A paper describes a structure:
[name] is a saprotrophic bacterium which possesses the remarkable ability to grow in isolation using a variety of hemicellulosic polysaccharides as sole carbon sources. It produces a diverse collection of GHs, assembling enzyme systems that can degrade cellulose, xylans, mannans, and xyloglucans, among others. Effective xyloglucan-degrading GH systems (recently reviewed by Attia and Brumer) contain exo-acting glycosidases acting as debranching accessory enzymes and endo-acting enzymes (xyloglucanases) that generate short, branched β-(1,4)-glucan oligomers (xyloglucan oligosaccharides).18−23Exo-acting enzymes are expected to address each of the glycosidic linkages reported in xyloglucan branches, though the reported enzyme diversity falls short of reported branch diversity. The work presented here comprises the design and validation of trisaccharidic xyloglucan (“XyG”)-type cyclophellitol probes and their validation as bona fide, predictive tools for the identification of xyloglucanase activities and their discrimination from cellulase activities within a xyloglucan-elicited [name] degradome.
To determine the molecular basis for the reactivity of ABP-XyG-Cy5 with [name] but not CjCel5C, we crystallized both enzymes and solved their structures by molecular replacement in both unliganded and ABP-bound forms. In contrast, [name] recognizes ABP-XyG-N3 with (−83°, 133°) torsion angles. The consequent twist in the glucose backbone positions the α-(1,6)-xylose residue above W28 and W33, forming a hydrogen bond between O4 and D64. Notably, the active site cleft of [name] is significantly more open beyond the −2 subsite, so we hypothesized that cellulase-specificity in [name] is dictated primarily by an inability to accommodate α-(1,6)-xylose residues in the positive subsites. [name] showed a ∼14-fold preference for 4MU-GGGG over 4MU-XXXG, roughly in line with its sevenfold preference for ABP-Cel-N3 over ABP-XyG-N3 but highly divergent from its 3000-fold specificity toward carboxymethyl cellulose (CMC) over xyloglucan, supporting our hypothesis. Measurements of irreversible inhibition kinetics showed strong selectivity of Cel5C for ABP-Cel-N3 over ABP-XyG-N3 and only weak selectivity of [name] for ABP-Cel-N3 over ABP-XyG-N3, matching in-gel fluorescence results. Pulldowns from saturation cultures using ABP-βGlc-Bio, ABP-Cel-Bio, and ABP-XyG-Bio unambiguously identified Cel5D as the only exclusively ABP-XyG-Bio-reactive band, Cel5C as the exclusively ABP-Cel-Bio-reactive band, and Cel3A, Cel3B, and Cel3D as the ABP-βGlc-reactive bands. The secreted ABP-Cel- and ABP-XyG-reactive band in the arabinoxylan secretome (the intense band in Figure 3A, last lane) was identified as [name]. The band of interest was found exclusively in the secretome while Cel5D was found in the cell fraction, so the secretome was collected and concentrated 50-fold by ultrafiltration prior to pulldown using ABP-XyG-Bio.
Residue numbers in the entry: 1 to 298
The structure:
Amino acid sequence: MVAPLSVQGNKILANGQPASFSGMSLFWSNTEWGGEKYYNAQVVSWLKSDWNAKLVRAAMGVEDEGGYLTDPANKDRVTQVVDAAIANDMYVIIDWHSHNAHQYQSQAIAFFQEMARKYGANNHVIYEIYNEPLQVSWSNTIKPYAQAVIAAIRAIDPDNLIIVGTPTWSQDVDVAANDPITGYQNIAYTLHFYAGTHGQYLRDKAQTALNRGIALFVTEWGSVNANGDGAVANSETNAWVSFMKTNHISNANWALNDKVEGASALVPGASANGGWVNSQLTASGALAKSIISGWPSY
């Protein structure tokens, strides 16, 4: 058992105090996308014991090739991680990893209903219903999808956090803050930043959203470019880390994966079952492990 998370204004609370949790996003769960081998109990317990992670995100592909809509095996991999997180007293994000979730609303509702029924009683579970909306209306496209999916979760699970994607690849948290979801408790809003691409401009939008009284949750962030490749931006990453520690913002680094790209935490061939020596981390993985392991415990 872990502390139940709630939202009060711009804070996520645990044990009656602002609290924040640091860990890794798994890569896309999709069949033959390469991330899938890391969807297992051994990776989850290694992240806890070696990285001191208190958070793992299962990034379940939806309408993209080899995703949940065409290969239900995606959900078996989510189940493995969620079960493992619960066994290790770690928070787990169930991420509907779509850029167009509002086009697959019925499928989203059915999936979150199933996840709520199975896992709703565990305080570990965090629902993320819409990874990264594109350049679409908050009020007219995202919010009504959010309302429909939240209603369905909340009929089954009245408490557990629901994180809602925001416009422009989950950047426009200031926009969401101007028309928040008020109808349901324990709703927080997605912020995504890639330190090779995003600095103070996006932090200012985040500050505006916090000032307007909504809670943020960085379910995905990178130390490299927005496209998941490029050099590690150490200085900008540290600026984001200070911002997130100051505002008690939970964070999952993209990505626990071995693909040849800057965002991968692991060198190609890093064991599917964990145990990685530090020399089998990339610059991004070494920076992500230093951030997660150093995260305030509260």
